[PDB]
UniProtKB/Swiss-Prot annotation:
Binds 1 Fe(3+) ion per subunit. One of its GO terms (molecular function) is electron transfer activity. The keyword DNA-binding does not apply. Disulfide bonds: none annotated. Rubredoxin is a small nonheme, iron protein lacking acid-labile sulfide. Its single Fe, chelated to 4 Cys, functions as an electron acceptor and may also stabilize the conformation of the molecule. Its cofactor is Fe(3+). Keywords: Electron transport, Iron, Metal-binding, Transport. This is Rubredoxin. InterPro entries: Rubredoxin (IPR024922), Rubredoxin-like_dom (IPR024934), Rubredoxin_dom (IPR024935), Rubredoxin_ET (IPR050526), Rubredoxin_Fe_BS (IPR018527).
Length: 52
């Protein structure tokens, strides 16, 4: 699944992960650590929402 950051153009795709910051491809949103933030704008998990 994919989630948009409300605050910038970034999209977290679970099939991509966030590898530059230590999150492997295939990591589900539910499994991102509580201190994970948007790689571009620093917004927290509470500022992400599912998109298609
Ligand atoms: Fe962002
Ligand atoms: Na969790
Ligand atoms: Na970073």
């Amino acid at each position: 699944a994919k989630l948009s950051c409300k605050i910038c153009g970034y999209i977290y795709d679970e099939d991509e992960g966030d590898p530059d910051n230590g999150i492997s491809p295939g990591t589900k949103f539910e499994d991102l650590p509580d201190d994970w933030v948007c790689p571009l704008c620093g917004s927290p998990k509470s500022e992400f929402e599912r998109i298609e």
